């Protein structure tokens, strides 16, 4: 594209062609994330802490989203559809690819959308980093039962079985097609953009 790719190595979040973007790490030099035209970044880690990077919008809600991606991690990675809300706080993940460790926790059933079927748990964080500093709060899971690297995803169903399970979202903030792990290396390239069937 016309778009002068940078490099971002240090945590935060702004507008690139439209889309929101979100780099965050406890491990600054050991990953970094590339701004590519349109909804499209890249990762790339060594030896890293925690990090999540990803493109989408600053305020979330019942988007129905279409990826692609590539995705090479050779530890503990996902690729998720990832968000934040408030009161509650919450993180929620929906697990599209993961690495050398699948997500689980307390299993609340599933939900079948978008050609396959997603394992749901709930877990906990206590006192970690979050939107509103140092927090303890609930996460949400949707795990899909085979690993994709492209495709649609409805976000409102999603929301919706969570609900059923009492699984209950506050306000919403940021919404993003992100990478995210700790420690280990790898990469990613993933392109997101709102459109496709619900
Ligand atoms: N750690
Ligand atoms: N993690």
Redesign the pocket.
């Known amino acids: 594209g016309s778009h002068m790719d940078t490099t971002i190595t240090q945590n935060q979040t702004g507008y690139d062609n439209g889309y929101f973007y979100s780099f965050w790490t406890?491990a600054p030099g050991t990953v970094s994330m590339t701004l590519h035209s349109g909804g499209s970044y890249s990762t790339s880690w060594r030896n890293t802490?925690?990090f999540k990077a990803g493109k989408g919008w600053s305020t979330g809600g019942r988007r129905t989203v279409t990826y692609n991606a590539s995705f090479n991690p050779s530890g503990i990675a996902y690729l998720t559809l990832y968000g934040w809300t408030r009161n509650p706080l919450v993180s929620y993940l929906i697990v599209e690819s993961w690495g050398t460790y699948r997500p689980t926790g307390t299993y609340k059933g599933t939900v079948t959308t978008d050609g396959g079927t997603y394992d749901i748990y709930e877990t906990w964080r206590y006192n970690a980093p979050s939107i509103e500093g140092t927090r303890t709060f609930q996460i949400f899971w949707s795990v899909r039962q085979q690993k994709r690297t492209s495709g649609t995803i409805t976000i409102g169903n999603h929301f919706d079985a969570w609900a059923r399970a009492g699984m209950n979202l506050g306000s919403h903030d940021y919404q993003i097609m992100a990478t995210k792990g700790?420690?280990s290396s790898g990469s990613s390239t993933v392109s997101i953009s709102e459109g496709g069937n619900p």
């Open positions: 406890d802490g925690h700790w420690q």
